[PDB]
C-alpha cells in the first residue's frame, strides 16, 4: 500500500488542507456537530471571520486574513460578504454533479 497518506510538504498541500478545514467546518454534519460554531453563528446564519481566523487549525495552516478570506470566498460551500466581515455556508446547490468550474 502506502507508508502514510500525504507526501512532501509544499504551499499546494498547505492551501489544500486549509480549504478542506473551512469546507468541512462549514459542512452540514460539522455545523450540527460543532455546538460551539452554531452558538457563535449570527441571526442570519452568518459566522464571524474572526472566529474562523482564530481557529487553531486555521492559524497553524495560515496566519494571513487576506489568504483565508480568499479561500472562503473562492470556495462555493462558503461565501464571504463582498466587504469581508461575515461568511455563510452556501445553503444552495449551484452545480448538479459532474459539473464544476
Swiss-Prot record:
Coiled coil: none
Source species, domain of life: Eukaryota
Subcellular localization, as worded in the UniProt entry: Cytoplasm, Stress granule; Cytoplasm, Cytosol
Domain HTH La-type RNA-binding: 8-95
Subunit structure, interactors included: Interacts (via N-terminal region) with PABPC1. Interacts with RACK1.
Functional summary from the UniProt entry: RNA binding protein that binds to the poly-A tract of mRNA molecules. Associates with the 40S ribosomal subunit and with polysomes. Plays a role in the regulation of mRNA translation. Plays a role in the regulation of cell morphology and cytoskeletal organization.
The protein's name in its UniProt record: La-related protein 4
Lineage of producing organism: Eukaryota, Metazoa, Chordata, Craniata, Vertebrata
Amino acid at each position: 500500500g502506502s507508508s502514510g497518506s500525504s507526501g512532501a510538504v509544499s504551499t499546494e498541500d498547505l492551501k489544500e488542507c486549509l480549504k478542506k478545514q473551512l469546507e468541512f467546518c462549514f459542512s452540514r454534519e460539522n455545523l450540527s456537530k460543532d455546538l460551539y460554531l452554531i452558538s457563535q453563528m449570527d441571526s442570519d446564519q452568518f459566522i464571524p471571520i474572526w472566529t474562523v481566523a482564530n481557529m487553531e487549525e486555521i492559524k497553524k495552516l495560515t496566519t494571513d486574513p487576506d489568504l483565508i478570506l480568499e479561500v472562503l470566498r473562492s470556495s462555493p460551500m462558503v461565501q464571504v460578504d463582498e466587504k469581508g466581515e461575515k461568511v455563510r455556508p452556501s445553503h444552495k446547490r449551484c452545480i448538479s454533479g459532474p459539473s464544476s468550474g
